[PDB]
Design an enzyme around this catalytic site. Structure first.
Site, short mmCIF file in Angstrom:
data_model
loop_
_atom_site.label_atom_id
_atom_site.label_comp_id
_atom_site.label_asym_id
_atom_site.label_seq_id
_atom_site.Cartn_x
_atom_site.Cartn_y
_atom_site.Cartn_z
N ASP A 187 -6.94 -2.89 2.83
CA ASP A 187 -5.81 -3.81 2.70
C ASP A 187 -6.15 -5.17 3.32
O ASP A 187 -5.38 -6.12 3.18
CB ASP A 187 -4.55 -3.23 3.37
N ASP A 209 0.86 -1.16 0.00
CA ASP A 209 0.00 0.00 0.00
C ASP A 209 0.91 1.23 0.00
O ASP A 209 2.10 1.12 0.35
CB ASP A 209 -0.88 -0.05 1.25
MG LIG Z 1 -2.92 3.07 3.48
#
Ligand SMILES: [Mg+2]
Ligand SMILES: *[C@@H]1O[C@H](CO)[C@@H](O[C@@H]2O[C@H](CO)[C@@H](O)[C@H](O)[C@H]2NC(C)=O)[C@H](O)[C@H]1NC(C)=O
Ligand SMILES: CC(C)CCC[C@@H](C)[C@H]1CC[C@H]2[C@@H]3CC=C4C[C@@H](O)CC[C@]4(C)[C@H]3CC[C@]12C
Ligand SMILES: *[C@@H]1O[C@H](CO)[C@@H](O)[C@H](O)[C@H]1NC(C)=O
Ligand SMILES: [K+]
Ligand SMILES: [K+]
Ligand SMILES: [Tl+]
Lengths: 992, 268, 39
Positions: free
Chosen positions: A690, A345
């Site tokens: 995520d 990420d």
């Molecule tokens: Mg993030």
């Protein structure tokens, strides 16, 4: 099952307000009926998330009790009770042997069960975190009246109302809104407030303004909407199910364990039954044939090995806990070392997640600010009088303020009330000009026009702090081009000057460069109003232009971005030097994603995308050979229409990959794609978007400070200080523990041979039993334990971060080279040293080696209390047995003595002890405590009854010394050959 | 093949052949040096045989000799071992002045034939006639058990002195030259009868010290025949034969350390 | 000696045990010292 959830969603934001009501039998104004709502409740079910069915801990514990070694130890434990039963019936045996040994072995299985159970832990509460995002209550309009209800009682069709500060109770179709802004970071990982209004503004429902989602919150304003989805059917409720539902799977380290279990179990059953029949052929009674088998079991199974592994893992996890790196799952301690691909990420992971001033354009010059948290950079400018003019506008034309009671925490870390850009500017000036509050006290604001959607600028009028003037200063900021159309002069190095086309072009250049860096650019200008035209009491009208807003003086530009964390660029390079591929996977926009990619080193200098080639060469993208582009940037909207095979080609054909504007399922898909190619993959993230990717990853790593609760539930490891450098440490620790496990395993296995061989010669030679079953457990469960563990503290023999990641298909934890060395070479030398001491004890008591062959028959005969030795003396039953048990004791001690050398040789796989040294204090501790234990077990009174350990004479201790030394020399000579010729012979045969 | 190529399979064989060959040669070397440190006439240690064991001829199933008088093949098992021992004490086995000698027909003192050296031939042992064992096919009814003191090189069995009280209080106390053996069971339902050298219930000290198999082959150790003409029948009788002396001791673990454990039962 | 050679069939297992246990203890202490050089 979850393949449906891996797909992009379909919606009804395209419908009109009225049309949407027909679909849900609803009223736009009155809302649902109390009766109709209750009807729909029973119909669709509750607005809630149900946690997936878990496996009870019962079944989890018992599943370990049947894994190769435990199976063999069970067969031994029962076979003990078998022989005991056969005894209790036939000849009344008042002994406790088979009974107690059967109890002991069953305990070994249970305790070993706890160790493997502790290692195979799965702390997962994904669905629980998601459930925490549904509010307890919601506001609905029913029968034309607003009331608060249990949010679970919310159904598709009713009219819901939200306002700043509350969580979206369900997926809504916006029908009415007033200044409504929302935080969609749950779906994007970006926290910048997104406006919500009834108007449809994008074909993509995840981008349109007329949809509000469950799992997000309203940040300001007010809105009303019609519920379109409830519970599991919401966009993020499905993500919840996907994330919580994903099959965990076996770790790389776990797979390695099972693999050597098969090998050792294989040789165990082989020799087990190979000698069981070999005994019956020799005319051994089944009564004995089973007793020998039990011994064979105990000899072949390394009873203390699985627990060693667990302890070595635990100790490695303790060291990482001390670097702010929390490990939730003991096995994840190793996965990072085997990682070949990192999917990361961006926002809050690679980046600080905070709009920060990056550059400034004044005096016809680009200046760079320090973006790092701890401010590890340097200054840019302080001298220029222009800077102080720009600095004053940044402070004065700013409505942001620090929250109360932050004076303790550093400037860049403190919470600010305001939009991201004003906070950035606040922190910029506060840092390099001291207290901003001071500047806003010295220059009292009298009138201001806050930033307008239409004006595209913000202006302020202040009382000049100067005493010799005390007049009125005008400052304004806004869109760079808009500010330019309002300027006549430029504050160059102090003095103003006309705005000629020259400087105007340099402005455009500066503007284009900063924007190219993916940075948000603002213009800054001021104007000292004429004194005679503006008295000390002159009133300024903010509603109607009561003052000039043209012919102002342009001071400068300022640019900003959510910057990388200080350690990130260097950590990325280090991962790449270790041959790990680093991919970016973000919900953020492509321009920003690409710019940070270059900033942190995901995309190295000079590498191009197909789009870059096309623009440079000024040609169509279809005219570009895509193989000429090693870098790529894939938008989520294009990813959506690509098959997995095509995704696989992207992964194969590019070294530098950026996946931007991805949804949570898309992150999962990219992870799976990488895995499909046979790669061990790590995910790093901090958002709820995520969660699926973190779950599917071989190892998920979440950020501890910036991380959302969901992300940290989905992860195997938490970086408690957000220190990305820990990934580099983690991979290094992971590789080191992998090598050290080999050393510890070889060490443990080596001593199996001297425990097996005595039982074999007992059958083939018909001599007195050299070593007992109990004696074996005193080794594997006693003496070898601390030494085996101590190998986990071994330093690297070379620069492990310089080698490529292991191939999990070829590079195994236990291979043929380990067995050859442990079983075929070193263990064989240990066996002899054991036998030697055995022959020494017997021969010095009167039974010379020659007369021992084929004597067990009379030796074990309990009724012959007069066996003749070599010298013609006669021994009773118990007398010769004392010598025999003394033989077991010295054979035992011989193992310990030969394990001294083995411990030192297992220290290093390649290097010499004279190179690696003896700086492992735990290892040295092991040597001393091992010897202390052995001595205690031999000399402590009463141990001759409980363990059949007898006192050894001083000379006995030294029997195996010449064998212990041969081991040290042999292995030192062998490794000398390895180093002296990287060719292969000694290497490909014995190099663990 | 499984692992490697033929060339590799060969090399791994050439290695382990030379390797294990060396290891065998080294192991043998260490055995050589061990033997080189040992005497041919006397063992390095003797503390583990120290207190002599007392063993008998009737091969006990479990320290027990039960049988039926009214049955032939009921005792023919115990007569096999009884014969095995006494068959060695034949007169035809003891012929000529070599290597045997006629010793006192009455319990006498020790006999030192020098040291544990080969500086002399086979040290001459005292003769022993199985004919000294009066009354004892063997006792088909009421067994005639034969006792024996375990041989220990250089061991001088020393009888107890009549200074204080004794079990068989002062009866036929040949204090100076006899190692007594008194069998017992309360539970006095038997009839102890002892036979031996000179008619005494002991071991004649003239058969000591033993010089070992290497320096004294064909050597004969003294026997003590014991007969239990008990007037009882059809019950397990735990009879313990105990030897007494200065160098004689016992253990709760080793039930053969200078004593017997016989469970006779004439179940007829 | 001659008939008085009782010492030939004797061994001081008591002293050996005392010494053996002393050694085991001291090796145990020495080990702690080296380990505790940093914890
Ligand atoms: Mg993030
Ligand atoms: C030792 O003495 C025994 C005494 O019983 C001998 O047994 C003789 O065996 C033969 C042939 O089987 C019989 O004819 C005799 O009746 C037995 N007794 C005697 C006194 O001769 C036995 O043979 C002798 N053993 C050796 C090796 O000489
Ligand atoms: C007690 C004695 C008689 C048993 C001796 C067993 C010997 C023959 C065994 C023990 C360990 C064995 C070796 C262990 C490892 C390897 C490497 C593998 O890639 C091929 C087989 C090979 C080379 C084995 C061959 C046979 C071997 C050398
Ligand atoms: C033993 O045998 C003799 C003959 O040799 C005989 O006179 C005597 O009665 C027997 N003794 C016993 C107790 O039976
Ligand atoms: K995972
Ligand atoms: K072992
Ligand atoms: Tl073992």
């Amino acid at each position: 099952l979850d393949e449906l959830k891996k797909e992009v969603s379909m919606d009804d934001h395209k419908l009109s307000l009225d049309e949407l009501h027909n679909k849900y039998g609803t009223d736009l104004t009155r809302g649902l009926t109390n009766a109709r709502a209750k009807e729909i409740l029973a119909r669709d079910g509750p607005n809630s998330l149900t946690p997936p069915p878990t496996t009870p801990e019962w079944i989890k514990f018992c599943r370990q009790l049947f894994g190769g070694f435990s199976i063999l130890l069970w067969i031994g434990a029962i076979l003990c009770f078998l022989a005991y039963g056969i005894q209790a019936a036939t000849e009344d045996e008042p002994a406790n042997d088979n009974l107690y040994l059967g109890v002991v072995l069953s305990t070994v299985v249970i305790v070993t069960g706890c160790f493997s159970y502790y290692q195979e832990a799965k702390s997962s509460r994904i669905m629980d975190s998601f459930k925490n995002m549904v509010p307890q209550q919601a506001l609905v309009i029913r029968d034309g009246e607003k009331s608060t209800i249990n949010a679970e009682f919310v159904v598709a069709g009713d009219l819901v109302e939200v306002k700043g500060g509350d969580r979206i109770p369900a997926d809504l179709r916006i029908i009415s809104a007033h200044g409504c802004k929302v935080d969609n970071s749950s779906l994007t990982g970006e926290s910048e407030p997104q406006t919500r209004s009834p108007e449809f503004s994008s074909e993509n429902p995840l981008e349109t303004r007329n949809i509000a989602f469950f799992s997000t919150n309203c940040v300001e304003g007010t809105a009303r909407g019609v519920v379109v989805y409830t519970g599991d059917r919401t966009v993020m409720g499905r993500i919840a199910t996907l994330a919580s539902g994903l099959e965990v799977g076996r770790t790389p380290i776990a797979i390695e364990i099972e693999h050597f279990i098969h090998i050792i179990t294989g040789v165990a059953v082989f020799l087990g039954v190979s000698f069981f029949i070999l005994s019956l052929i020799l005319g051994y009674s089944w009564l004995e044939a089973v007793i020998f088998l039990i011994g064979i079991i105990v000899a072949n199974v390394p009873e203390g090995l699985l627990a060693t592994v667990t302890v070595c893992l635990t100790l490695t996890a303790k060291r990482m806990a001390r670097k702010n790196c929390l490990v939730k799952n003991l096995e994840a301690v190793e996965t990072l070392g085997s990682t070949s691909t990192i999917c990361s990420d961006k926002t809050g992971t690679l980046t600080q997640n905070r709009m920060t001033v990056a550059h400034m354009w004044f005096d016809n010059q680009i200046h760079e600010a320090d973006t790092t948290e701890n401010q590890s950079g340097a200054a840019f400018d302080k001298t220029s009088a222009t800077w102080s003019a720009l600095s004053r506008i940044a402070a004065l034309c700013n409505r942001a303020v620090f929250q109360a009671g932050q004076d303790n925490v550093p400037i860049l870390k403190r919470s600010v009330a305001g939009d991201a850009s004003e906070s950035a500017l606040l922190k910029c000036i506060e840092l390099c000009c001291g207290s901003v509050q001071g500047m806003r006290d010295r220059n009292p604001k009298i009138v201001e026009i806050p930033f307008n959607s239409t004006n595209k600028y913000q202006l302020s009028i202040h009382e000049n702090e100067k005493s010799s003037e005390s007049r009125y200063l005008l400052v304004m900021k806004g869109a760079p081009e808009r500010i330019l159309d309002r300027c006549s002069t430029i504050l160059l190095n102090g003095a103003e000057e006309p705005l000629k086309e020259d400087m105007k072009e340099a402005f455009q250049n500066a503007y284009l460069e900063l924007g190219g860096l993916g940075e948000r650019v603002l213009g800054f200008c001021h104007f000292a109003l004429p004194e005679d035209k503006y008295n000390e009491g002159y009133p300024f009208d903010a509603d109607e232009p009561n003052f000039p807003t043209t012919d102002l003086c342009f001071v400068g530009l300022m640019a900003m971005i959510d910057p990388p964390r200080a350690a990130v660029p260097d950590a990325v390079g280090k991962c790449r030097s270790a041959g790990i591929k680093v991919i970016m996977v973000t919900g953020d926009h492509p321009i920003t994603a690409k710019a940070i990619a270059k900033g942190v080193g995901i995309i190295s200098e000079g590498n191009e995308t197909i789009e870059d080639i096309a623009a440079r060469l000024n040609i169509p993208i279809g005219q570009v050979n895509p193989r000429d582009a090693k870098a790529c940037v894939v938008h989520g909207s294009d990813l959506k229409d690509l098959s997995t095979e095509v995704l696989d080609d992207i992964l194969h054909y590019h070294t530098e990959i950026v996946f931007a504007r991805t949804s949570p399922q898309q992150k999962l898909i990219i992870v799976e794609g990488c895995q499909r190619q046979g790669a061990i993959v790590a995910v790093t993230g901090d958002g709820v978007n995520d969660s699926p990717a973190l779950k599917k990853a071989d190892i998920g790593v979440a950020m501890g400070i910036s991380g959302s609760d969901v992300s940290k539930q989905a992860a195997d490891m938490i970086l408690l200080d957000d220190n990305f450098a820990s990934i580099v440490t983690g991979v290094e620790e992971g590789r080191l523990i992998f090598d050290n496990l080999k050393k510890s395993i070889a060490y443990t296995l080596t001593s199996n041979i001297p425990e097996i061989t005595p039982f074999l010669v007992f059958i083939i030679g018909n001599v007195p039993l050299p070593l007992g079953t109990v004696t074996i457990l005193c080794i594997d469960l006693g003496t070898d334990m601390v030494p085996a563990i101590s190998l986990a503290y071994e330093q690297a023999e070379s620069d492990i971060m310089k080698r490529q990641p292991r191939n999990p298909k070829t590079d195994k934890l236990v291979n043929e080279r380990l067995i050859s060395m442990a079983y075929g070479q070193i263990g064989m030398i240990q066996a002899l040293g054991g036998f030697f001491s055995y022959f020494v004890i017997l021969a010095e008591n009167g039974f010379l080696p020659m007369d021992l062959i084929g004597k067990r028959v009379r030796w074990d005969d309990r009724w012959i209390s007069d066996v003749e030795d070599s010298f013609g003396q006669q021994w009773t039953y118990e007398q010769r047995k004392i010598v025999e048990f003394t033989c077991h004791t010295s054979f035992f001690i011989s193992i310990v003595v030969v394990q001294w050398a083995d411990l030192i040789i297992c220290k290093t796989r390649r290097n010499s002890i004279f190179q690696q040294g003896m700086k492992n204090k735990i290892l040295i501790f092991g040597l001393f405590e091992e010897t202390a234990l052995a001595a205690f077990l031999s000399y402590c009174p009463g141990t001759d009854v409980a363990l059949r350990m007898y006192p050894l004479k001083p000379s006995w201790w030294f029997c195996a010394f010449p064998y212990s030394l041969i081991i040290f020399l042999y292995d030192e000579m062998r490794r000398f050959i390895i180093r002296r010729s990287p060719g292969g012979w000694v290497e490909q045969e014995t190099y663990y | 093949f499984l692992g490697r190529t033929g060339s590799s399979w060969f090399k791994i064989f050439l290695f382990y052949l030379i390797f294990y060959g060396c290891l065998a040669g080294i192991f043998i070397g260490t055995i050589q040096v061990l033997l080189l440190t040992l005497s041919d006439f006397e063992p390095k240690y003797q503390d583990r045989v120290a207190p002599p064991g007392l063993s008998h001829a009737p091969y006990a199933i479990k320290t027990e000799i039960s049988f039926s008088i009214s049955n032939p093949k009921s005792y023919e098992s115990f007569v096999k071992s009884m014969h095995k021992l006494m068959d060695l004490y034949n007169e035809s086995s003891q012929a000529g002045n070599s290597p045997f000698e006629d010793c006192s027909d009455t319990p006498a003192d020790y006999i030192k034939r020098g040291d544990l050296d080969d500086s002399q031939g086979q040290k001459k042992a005292c003769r022993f006639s199985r004919m000294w064992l009066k009354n004892c096919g063997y006792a088909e009814g009421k067994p005639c058990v034969v006792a024996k003191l375990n041989r220990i090189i250089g061991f001088y069995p020393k009888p107890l002195k009549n200074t204080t009280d004794l079990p068989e209080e002062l009866q036929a106390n040949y204090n100076q030259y006899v190692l007594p053996l008194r069998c017992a069971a309360r539970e006095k339902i038997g009839s102890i009868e002892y036979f031996g050298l000179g008619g005494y219930a002991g071991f004649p000290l003239q058969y000591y010290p033993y010089y070992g198999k290497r320096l004294q082959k064909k050597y004969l150790q003294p026997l003590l025949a014991i007969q239990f003409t008990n007037l009882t029948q059809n019950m397990e009788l735990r009879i313990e034969c105990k030897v007494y002396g200065e160098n004689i001791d016992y253990s709760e673990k080793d039930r053969f350390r200078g004593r017997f454990e016989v469970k006779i039962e004439v179940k007829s | 000696e001659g008939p008085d050679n009782d010492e030939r069939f004797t061994y001081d297992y008591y002293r050996l045990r005392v010494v053996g246990l002393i050694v085991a203890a001291v090796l145990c202490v020495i080990g702690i010292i080296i380990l505790l050089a940093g914890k």
